[PDB]
Design a protein around this ligand. Structure first.
Ligand SMILES: NC(=O)c1ccc[n+]([C@@H]2O[C@H](COP(=O)([O-])OP(=O)(O)OC[C@H]3O[C@@H](n4cnc5c(N)ncnc54)[C@H](OP(=O)(O)O)[C@@H]3O)[C@@H](O)[C@H]2O)c1
Length: 294
């Protein structure tokens, strides 16, 4: 009943777009944030054409690059002067840190090899490329961008909007993570120990793991130092984001702060449920689709 305002980052396509659609259809007023201003304007138009023109006031486009402090600051100013309030943040903007050379479909072979680790717990530490048809390339610069967006980007946006969210009588933060965030994939025993800590976990320790991974990745010692052979930056960054989610869950008990592994419309249901979570919902948990954990 009570009017709510939500930010969804990286929301011009993919699951973000579907999160926005589903919040707007429930009466939430949504800020559709996109790295490029014109694609977000265009995404809003399609969103309004699909829901109906009566939703035109419930969706607003705003440029947002989570890696750019000035972009973040401009978004806080926009929300301040247009609405005055914020209730929901969905951190959906994200990068893989990888691309395909050659046949792009070999990616399904790489994703398959990772997913068997769930059925076996045997976390391979040696790089295995399933075919010579394609290759999953992970450059040093893409590893930096991936950490800078997934960890520091999400954290930058969260801390800029917390002051606004804290004036909500039910503030909600949802961090879109990945199954590759699971510690079964964290080959590096030091880093796994940090991520596993329930006591004495600090943002400082998380950032030390990130810097250590980036130093060994630059130095070319990814396998020497027992870092994951594939999706390496992605795994470390999304695990850090999970751990960071628990840290701020404990800092702000009056908030509900959660991570969630997510067709796109179906995958948006899980973050959407967490964005409208009741007062007694959990906080500090990583959810797989629609199932509890904490
Ligand atoms: N593929 C899956 O089914 C799957 C599975 C598990 C987890 N996820 C997670 O779910 C989220 C949604 O991704 P997706 O699968 O829908 O992929 P996607 O289509 O590539 O969407 C990612 C979105 O993030 C935006 N983005 C990236 N870097 C940004 C930055 N610097 N600042 C602001 N926006 C930025 C992109 O904007 P541009 O269009 O301007 O590039 C894009 O709209 C991600 O966080 C991803 O890690 C996805």
């Amino acid at each position: 009943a009570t009017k709510r305002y939500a930010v969804v980052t990286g929301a011009n396509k993919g699951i973000g777009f579907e999160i926005c659609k589903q919040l707007a259809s429930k009466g939430i007023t949504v800020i559709l944030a996109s790295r490029d201003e014109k694609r977000g304007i265009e995404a809003r138009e399609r969103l309004i054409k699909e829901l109906g023109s009566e939703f035109g006031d419930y969706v607003v486009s705003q440029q947002l690059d989570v890696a750019d402090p000035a972009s973040v600051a401009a978004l806080v100013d926009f929300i301040k002067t247009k609405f005055g309030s914020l209730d929901i943040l969905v951190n959906n903007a994200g990068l893989n840190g990888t691309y395909m050379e050659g046949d792009a479909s070999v990616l399904n072979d790489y994703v398959e090899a990772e997913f068997k680790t769930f059925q076996s717990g045997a976390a391979k530490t040696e790089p295995y490329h399933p075919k010579a048809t394609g290759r999953l390339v992970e450059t040093v610069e893409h590893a930096k961008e991936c950490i800078e967006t997934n960890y520091y980007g999400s954290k930058r946006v969260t801390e800029a909007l917390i002051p606004l969210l804290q004036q909500s009588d039910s503030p909600r933060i949802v961090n879109v993570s990945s199954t590759l965030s699971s510690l079964v994939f964290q080959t590096n025993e030091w880093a796994k120990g940090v991520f596993s800590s329930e006591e004495g976990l600090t943002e400082e320790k998380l950032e030390e793991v990130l810097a250590e991974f980036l130093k060994d990745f630059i130095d070319g010692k990814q396998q020497e130092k027992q870092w994951p052979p594939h999706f390496s930056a992605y795994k470390v960054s999304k695990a850090a984001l999970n751990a960071y989610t628990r840290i701020i869950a404990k800092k702000y008990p009056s908030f509900r702060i959660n991570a969630v592994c997510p067709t796109d419309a179906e995958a948006a249901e899980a973050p959407v449920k967490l964005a409208l979570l009741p007062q007694g919902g959990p906080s500090g948990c990583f959810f797989f689709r629609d199932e509890a954990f904490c």
